């Protein structure tokens with residue numbers, strides 16, 4: 001039996017989380033996937049850093065989890081044929097493929113829901129830490145996948161399409177995307193990051209909370225990320 005660490009980078013998405021937990025738990029129980037949900041709550045006051053939270057969650061998750069799912073909290077599978085299985089030796093298994101995602105349709109999109117073996121994640125030194133605020137972190141990770149000699153696989157013979165494979169309950173005016181650029185964020189985050197990753201993410205876990213949501217156990221990690229403003233000053237544009 002494989003076990004999946006279901007990693008949910010998180011800040012101020014409480015109602016999303018209330019829908020997320022019962023839905024994913026039922027969904028995964030139906031296909032027999034053993035798993036645990038880790039809410040990666042970024043409690044520092046820097047801009048949202050999804051990828052660094054993933055790195056922290058990977059470090060925290062015990063050895064029993066031999067793969068991880070990096071998972072948006074607002075993106076729910078509607079098709080039971082989307083198998084959250086242990087990825088093959090080829091590399092990561094991308095569940096929310098561009099032919100299936102309601103919004104993102106470019107070929108190398110690996111955002112939303114991406115399953116990665118422990119060994120492969122380690123092999124790539126996890127995700128880049130330089131992505132403060134919305135965007136690009138998954139795209140650079142795609143390059144990390146190619147550079148590691150791995151490939152992305154996606155489920156075949158899925159019959160649903162872009163409008164009926166996932167619900168993406170995300171109103172752009174309610175949950176705003178932090179797309180601000182300051183300092184030379186534009187230039188720096190558009191290039192491959194060979195310098196940061198799993199092995200040097202800087203952080204403290206202030207608190208671990210064990211939460212039951214209608215009987216389903218879920219772990220909350222209160223994560224205080226560090227920002228080195230000598231390297232990534234765009235962690236805060238205030």
Ligand SMILES: O=c1ccn([C@@H]2O[C@H](COP(=O)(O)OP(=O)(O)O[C@H]3O[C@H](CO)[C@H](O)[C@H](O)[C@H]3O)[C@@H](O)[C@H]2O)c(=O)[nH]1
Pocket residue numbers: 008009010011012013048050071072073074075111112113133134135136137138170175176177
């Ligand atoms: O202030 C935030 C911002 C994001 N999130 C979490 O991060 C996830 C992804 O963020 P968004 O939903 O705001 O962004 P998108 O809907 O545009 O999703 C896509 O854009 C992101 C770019 O950063 C990621 O690549 C993401 O996986 C990809 O599906 C959210 O679902 C949520 O789980 C928060 O919890 N709080």
Ligand SMILES: O[C@@H]1[C@@H](O)[C@H](O[C@@H]2CO[C@@H](O)[C@H](O)[C@H]2O)OC[C@H]1O
Pocket residue numbers: 104109111112134135136137138139
């Ligand atoms: O992090 C990813 C974003 O970088 C990505 O942004 C896309 C970049 O190319 C543009 O043509 C697209 O319109 C734009 O969405 O979107 C997905 C996100 O995961």
Ligand SMILES: [Cl-]
Pocket residue numbers: 139140143189190191192
């Ligand atoms: Cl890039």
Ligand SMILES: [Cl-]
Pocket residue numbers: 152153154
């Ligand atoms: Cl494919």
Ligand SMILES: [Mn+2]
Pocket residue numbers: 072074168170
């Ligand atoms: Mn979203």
